Design an enzyme around this catalytic site. Sequence first.
Site, PDB file in Angstrom:
ATOM      1  N   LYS A   1      -8.941   1.304   1.261  1.00  0.00           N
ATOM      2  CA  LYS A   1     -10.320   1.727   1.089  1.00  0.00           C
ATOM      3  C   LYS A   1     -10.601   2.888   2.062  1.00  0.00           C
ATOM      4  CE  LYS A   1     -15.103   0.197   1.736  1.00  0.00           C
ATOM      5  NZ  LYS A   1     -16.031  -0.950   2.008  1.00  0.00           N
TER       6      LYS A   1
ATOM      7  N   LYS B   1      -9.883   1.920  -3.250  1.00  0.00           N
ATOM      8  CA  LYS B   1     -11.302   2.307  -3.305  1.00  0.00           C
ATOM      9  C   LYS B   1     -11.494   3.682  -2.647  1.00  0.00           C
ATOM     10  CE  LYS B   1     -15.895   0.721  -2.633  1.00  0.00           C
ATOM     11  NZ  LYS B   1     -16.664  -0.412  -2.174  1.00  0.00           N
TER      12      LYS B   1
HETATM   13 CL    CL Z   1     -15.015  -0.821   5.467  1.00  0.00          CL
HETATM   14 MG    MG Z   2     -19.057  -2.943   4.648  1.00  0.00          MG
END
Ligand code: CL
Ligand code: MG
Lengths: 328, 333, 333, 328, 333, 328
Positions: free
Chosen positions: B203, B258
């Site tokens: 992410k 992500k």
């Molecule tokens: Cl995060």
């Molecule tokens: Mg968060």
Amino acid sequence: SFTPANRAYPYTRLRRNRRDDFSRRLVRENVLTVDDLILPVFVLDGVNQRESIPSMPGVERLSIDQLLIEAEEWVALGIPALALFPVTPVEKKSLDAAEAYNPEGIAQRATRALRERFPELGIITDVALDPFTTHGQDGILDDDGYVLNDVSIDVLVRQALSHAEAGAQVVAPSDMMDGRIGAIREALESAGHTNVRVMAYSAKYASAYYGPFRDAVGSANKATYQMDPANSDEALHEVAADLAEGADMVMVKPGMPYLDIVRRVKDEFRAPTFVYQVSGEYAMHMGAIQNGWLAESVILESLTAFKRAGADGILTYFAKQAAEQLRR
Amino acid sequence: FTPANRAYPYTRLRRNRRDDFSRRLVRENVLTVDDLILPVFVLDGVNQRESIPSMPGVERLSIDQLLIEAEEWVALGIPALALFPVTPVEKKSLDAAEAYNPEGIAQRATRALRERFPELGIITDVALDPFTTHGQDGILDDDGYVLNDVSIDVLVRQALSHAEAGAQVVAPSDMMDGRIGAIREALESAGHTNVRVMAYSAKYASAYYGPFRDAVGSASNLGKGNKATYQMDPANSDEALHEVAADLAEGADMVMVKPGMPYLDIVRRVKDEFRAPTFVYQVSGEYAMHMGAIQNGWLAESVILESLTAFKRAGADGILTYFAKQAAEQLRR
Amino acid sequence: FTPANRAYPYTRLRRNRRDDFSRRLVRENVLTVDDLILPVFVLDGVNQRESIPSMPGVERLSIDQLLIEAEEWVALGIPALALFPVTPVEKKSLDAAEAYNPEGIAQRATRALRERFPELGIITDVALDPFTTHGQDGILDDDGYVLNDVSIDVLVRQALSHAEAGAQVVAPSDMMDGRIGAIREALESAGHTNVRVMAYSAKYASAYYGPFRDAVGSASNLGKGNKATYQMDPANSDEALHEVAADLAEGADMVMVKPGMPYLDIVRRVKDEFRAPTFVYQVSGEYAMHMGAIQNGWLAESVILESLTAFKRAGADGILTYFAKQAAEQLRR
Amino acid sequence: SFTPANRAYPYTRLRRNRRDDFSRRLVRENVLTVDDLILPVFVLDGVNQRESIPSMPGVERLSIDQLLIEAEEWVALGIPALALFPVTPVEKKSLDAAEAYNPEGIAQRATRALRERFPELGIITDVALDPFTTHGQDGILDDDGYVLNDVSIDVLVRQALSHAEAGAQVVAPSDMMDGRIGAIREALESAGHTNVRVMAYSAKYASAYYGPFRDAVGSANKATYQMDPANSDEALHEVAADLAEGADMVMVKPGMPYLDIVRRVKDEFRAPTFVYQVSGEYAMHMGAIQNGWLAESVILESLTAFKRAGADGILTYFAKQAAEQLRR
Amino acid sequence: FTPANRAYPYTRLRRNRRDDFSRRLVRENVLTVDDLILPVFVLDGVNQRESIPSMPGVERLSIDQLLIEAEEWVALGIPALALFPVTPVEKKSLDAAEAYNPEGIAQRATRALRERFPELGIITDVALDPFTTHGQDGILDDDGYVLNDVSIDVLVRQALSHAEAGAQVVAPSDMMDGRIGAIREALESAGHTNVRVMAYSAKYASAYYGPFRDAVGSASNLGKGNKATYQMDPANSDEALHEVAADLAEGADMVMVKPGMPYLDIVRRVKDEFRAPTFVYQVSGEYAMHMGAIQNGWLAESVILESLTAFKRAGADGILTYFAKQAAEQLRR
Amino acid sequence: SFTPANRAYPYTRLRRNRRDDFSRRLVRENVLTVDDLILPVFVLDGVNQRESIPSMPGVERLSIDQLLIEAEEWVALGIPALALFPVTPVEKKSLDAAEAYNPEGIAQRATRALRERFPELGIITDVALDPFTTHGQDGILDDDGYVLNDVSIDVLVRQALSHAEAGAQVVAPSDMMDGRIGAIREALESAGHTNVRVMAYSAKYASAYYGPFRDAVGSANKATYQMDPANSDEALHEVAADLAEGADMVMVKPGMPYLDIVRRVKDEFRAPTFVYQVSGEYAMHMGAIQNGWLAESVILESLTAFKRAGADGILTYFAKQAAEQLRR
Ligand SMILES: [Cl-]
Ligand SMILES: [Mg+2]
Ligand SMILES: [Cl-]
Ligand SMILES: [Cl-]
Ligand SMILES: [Cl-]
Ligand SMILES: [Cl-]
Ligand SMILES: [Cl-]
Ligand SMILES: [Mg+2]
Ligand SMILES: [Mg+2]
Ligand SMILES: [Mg+2]
Ligand SMILES: [Mg+2]
Ligand SMILES: [Mg+2]
Ligand SMILES: [Mg+2]
Ligand SMILES: [Mg+2]
Ligand SMILES: [Mg+2]
Ligand SMILES: [Mg+2]
Ligand SMILES: [Mg+2]
Ligand SMILES: [Mg+2]
Ligand SMILES: [Mg+2]
Ligand SMILES: [Mg+2]
Ligand SMILES: [Mg+2]
Ligand SMILES: [Mg+2]
Ligand SMILES: [Mg+2]
Ligand SMILES: [Mg+2]
Ligand SMILES: [Mg+2]
Ligand SMILES: [Mg+2]
Ligand SMILES: [Mg+2]
Ligand code: NA
Ligand code: NA
Ligand code: NA
Ligand code: NA
Ligand code: NA
Ligand code: NA
């Protein structure tokens, strides 16, 4: 490939390198530079002429004299190359696309002017029939309205040759005709244009992201030559063929929707690899920035992604804004 | 890859493209409703619906309204929802205790959905910033840095509270090191043997999260800490492999990349190297920029399915997307 | 690699070389200031600067002088310094206790720099030979051999003393087996969660270290033990992979190949196989031979950036180089 | 590739094999031998002539008679081959580089003399135009001062043929012209020189390390043919082409600054792979040894690195010193 | 491997073969004295030398005679000996206690050699069948099967006794599972930190061992158990990888393939996959068949160096060979 | 490649499968069968003639009539093929090796006789000049005594064609001439011999193990065509070339001293791969068995090794003994 080397928390904490700016900078795997940017430019027929494009906020079509003015800044910023897209007057369009190889066509005139005024600036011409056909299709049509492969190539070859004669350092065949890189390469070699580069649009998809460009050039069954978005393996066969046929650079088009393809192409062939951040990608980002929905920082982030994915060079309408930010 | 010496004109790649039937035969990937996860923003109260200006067509919904809308989601065959509560300002604290409140929005919503729609997957969000007053993704030390291990102790309690509420999947979204192992060890020790853990593995520190922040009310907290001390640098590809390797060793049943479209190369690498169930989040920024361009008439509606097909081609098994309902509807037809 | 049947004259590799713009487009690697680490030799006392004859243009500096010079290093954007104290002869002992003295040169310098330049990375040197009277790289047994595990116990205390002084990175440079794990376990147990460990993983028994020995006053100790009992044989490539694999398993955040240019194949192999943050030391011998040739007029100044570009092409993320300031200046322009 | 096999301290201690000389010797992965060494030699036009080179301490330019004298020792030491570099008299230089294929040029005369006196000694001739052009450029120039590829090859081909006729067992094309290995191979085959080896300078970089050699031969835009130092993938395409074109051996140049390239080339192609430890590398090491900054042991260490990286043979001005040390 | 489209007549592979100098340049592998290990058969008593009919030119030697012969071995630069004691019949027992006797032949010989020739490597043989009356390779259960773990307990004591005698390397040759780990754990716990373990990893149930059995007096015990319950089936290649992987995980410093020439594919696979120090035993049968053919005038003496070169080409770092002295002599010249 | 899958003692004990015959049989990775065996046979000129070979105990040279007698048993045992080696009478040897393509040469006569009497038995003829040259060299010599490549191939081609005409199902070119597989393939194709197999001796080494065969055929600088024992990578280039040139099967020679080469060849090309257990290998084993130094079981063990290494077929003088043991 990859060996996890039994790295385990808490001995390994990947946050350690992320702790301070200096260590983030040290481990940073990729960086975007002005050397990575190619600016596409829409070129008008007139003098002292500029037009705004409704679906490409901030982008202007420019007469060649205006192009020369703007190019001073682009050169000062260090942008290595332009990709020229002429906006052909409707009167010059025909069934035989003859305007494609007109020595006084916009692309040819623009190339000669730029090569003279900015000898170090790369000029990448568009080798394509659709700016020149009445029907706006990407080649010469048969009775059924199908784009003829080999007959279309005969025109592309004359066009590429006219661009070399105008002084273009790179020609970029963008219409997805089979074998065209080889035919264009044969012709350039036979004519003595040894050093003219060919930038193949190798893995070009049948995409909805091309919308705003069609507004830009005034052209608003592609599935019979452009690639199906679903297909990845197929892109490797497209690139392998273009390399064998003599391309000096190969391109994936669209860009961000196809970053996996960029990755596979660079990993498999280890050749100079380019990616087009297309008009729809530009408009999507610009629209969200002007709406105040996304921070202007997405521009650099989007371009960084191309580098990380394996691209050497990026065709992007953001090239001047990016260059400015990279400098200042 | 072996090119097998294929050469024009013997090989013409346009032949398979000539007709729809042959394009269909060779098509490498298809998107189906089985691939879709819908994120939903959940309000406190009753009979609440709020439009999100930066996410055209997305509403925050109170639970009663969520249940009503869920009838259509289930009817379309959407396999799961990812729940994101919109925490009332008054319930934010230094200690993020609301995260594990059995009467928190996420827990109440999970219990309601599990009863009403037993076959619908519920993916809860294991994270502390919805519950902190400073809006940072964990518990802060005296330097203003997010403490890794102390934050995990709160995340564990929260994940357990989700398991108790009936959630089939917990998705730890705050990028703390080792959190997958700690949560899994707790789930195992407590008897929640089959609670899935969907790790947000790779992410990135992204500008594409802007509209989500508007949706959950966090935008004005962004400046109060540095997400770059735990979220990944967008420049880094190799590093993603190490993130995923660790989460798999620690027990994740699914691993996630992500943002989505700006990181399709990472999806590819992760699927190629680990051959594990691989998920991707088409984030709020991605939805907004597509929606804005479609509403402007700059892009055809067909870009929605093109964007989603890309995730499948890149190697994703499932896609968290605010387009899930629009996509399922088109699919469907 | 697939050659893709490329053949002259269809393929002419000179076309991309024809013009500067196309050379720029296809250029595979670039060196930036983000890649540079400057090693610095640190004296005791005040207002001390000493030239090193075998390292033209390099000075040993007392701390006050170091702080003054550091203003320019930070202004050029050099991300980190690697500190090498020049230990007074009187502070050398059998037990290397000076290594962990809170008032040792390395600890004092670290504290001063961390206060004055909070964003500048400080990489301290975890090693015993600067502190031993015999100049060997650890504690000796009664046969004159360096005891592996006993040396580690001293290295651990020293690494902890560096963490307490504020160092963001400790770099264990004595080639003891298992030392990365032991130091990491100690850092973790003591709460120094984010102190980076930059392992000298594949460090070779080299003649290129001559001038550094002049810089730190160790040259006359070389004959008093055998470095080949812990430093790697220059002939061995496969062995480097095992060194690195172990240091990664033991928790290193960065792994390093030493010497640099004479071992560029090792940098390549290490980066290819592990995909981890990979560092390389362009050692004192390498600096000296380049400087000597430039001063003689035998080589153009441009060899400096050529040598550094090589490290980037081979796969290095960062380069420890006595040319860091000269390079940053050129870069810069 | 590589499997760490879960090796872990303290079960695994890599110091164990390092403990004693005998086990170090047993596990030692690579060893340099006299079979790996090729000695480059600068050859003068006269008789009873030697010159010292200011930027290459200890290296002499030698008339052919002096060369024959020194070669007795080189043969006695077991050095398998010489690489000849003539120091062309300025009066023999021209725009057409005709001296390149002169049957009585220095290279040709030197080859015939050595082949007769030392029939077992390998002679590697330099196939290059720059020792013979007035302008010292690496080929025939066009109006713009650009080095013409294919016209330069026509001269190289005649030169290679003159070297085969003089008896050279190996010809080494050093000027980075595209397709030249194929053209030279076609010509050697057609002329019946079946067994003349071609040692291609395949991955030769646009390097600053060539300085002292230019002093040595009397020659002090290469970026349009020599490789950009930044590029690694590109070297694979260079080698793949030269192998397809018929090279018996491929070379990377410079050496130590490009050891990663040596590694990639040997790993990818599994072909006979050579590396040039260039004049700048020699001068850097010699300068630091004479300054007393580095021990003479760096010579062997530097050469060991080439072997470890994957090189079969090394062109090195240290060849005689190395051979002596290896024997004694 | 990429063929790079090489094609006759452009590629003629005879060009490099044309002359000795070019053959020398491209030669891929060379054998040196550094690659050689000499196995030696050791008698009890004084002034004993016995010829072995099935191994022409090999003698069993009492220790005094061994020391005399060792002068020449060291002078030729042979790096190590592998010692094989010829155990007196009376010292064989059910419990194999002689294996760990400090006054056993192997221990006495090791002590004598270590004192006389400090730089000569001594590799001792860790195995029980030289010490059992039934001649099987371990301790038997009541079914006549070799007990794995009980045998290991005896092997451990023996390996410790070798370490105490000064041996730099112990080589466990009985194919018990897990024995490398057990011996290493014992060596580590006892402080023998640097004692190397040379594992017989992939050792096959072979008919090529016949003459060695004559050398050590075991031939008449062969029928009294089944070696196929621990030695590898000659048909099995993949299985070797698992043998080696385990021995490396368990701490072996060197791994070995036994027999040699009949298993050169295994040497190749083991070197390719693990990149570890890899050894091969050119066994008594291999020596005998070469010697017999040379003595008959059926084969030129040059087959000795051809056979040894094969081991180097296949990927071996070191070769245990009864030809070590003959080879070193030729090398040498 | 290979994944250790974290297998660890005591959970993993590799002795478990080794415990009982039945599980050993279940996991056994490779098995030798009569389908893997090819019997080389030395063929005399006369009638009712057999000769013993001093350095190949148990092996007889046989006149064609004796060959036909022995072949009944070889066929009954299921041996798929013979490799014929004629023992040429000294009077038929010449500088031009013309006996090689004599329609009434031993090889041709033997082939016709066997093809008629045992239509299912594979006959592999030897395509080589050395049984036919006065000088016993492996081709036609130039003035310097060097074996001429392309001139030697012209004779080999006529010889291969004579073998196809005699009915040989396989021709096996054993002399290490470059490009010979392609030339022989061109000629067979042009003559309409579509189905004649070519078994290339691809990786054939300059070996001392060939001694006893030279006694067998009466022939007691090979380094200029046979491979250097030290070289492994080189064998891959040899095989790649022979496959491209049209070989149906490729061979490594010698066998057991080159099992690593067998492994690499089968792994890299995945083509039908053969190995020659040469006369020296046979004599070494036979000598040690007759001396009572090694058990007769080494024969099967030696052959098993070839299978395990990747060989599809084995040329072995042990073929009949092996076949007998495999049956009974
Ligand atoms: Cl995060
Ligand atoms: Mg968060
Ligand atoms: Cl923390
Ligand atoms: Cl120790
Ligand atoms: Cl060290
Ligand atoms: Cl057992
Ligand atoms: Cl055993
Ligand atoms: Mg088009
Ligand atoms: Mg195409
Ligand atoms: Mg790149
Ligand atoms: Mg993580
Ligand atoms: Mg915002
Ligand atoms: Mg999939
Ligand atoms: Mg040290
Ligand atoms: Mg280590
Ligand atoms: Mg010195
Ligand atoms: Mg890098
Ligand atoms: Mg040149
Ligand atoms: Mg080239
Ligand atoms: Mg080598
Ligand atoms: Mg035993
Ligand atoms: Mg085992
Ligand atoms: Mg026997
Ligand atoms: Mg080796
Ligand atoms: Mg022959
Ligand atoms: Mg061949
Ligand atoms: Mg098989
Ligand atoms: Na670039
Ligand atoms: Na799916
Ligand atoms: Na970097
Ligand atoms: Na060599
Ligand atoms: Na060795
Ligand atoms: Na078979």
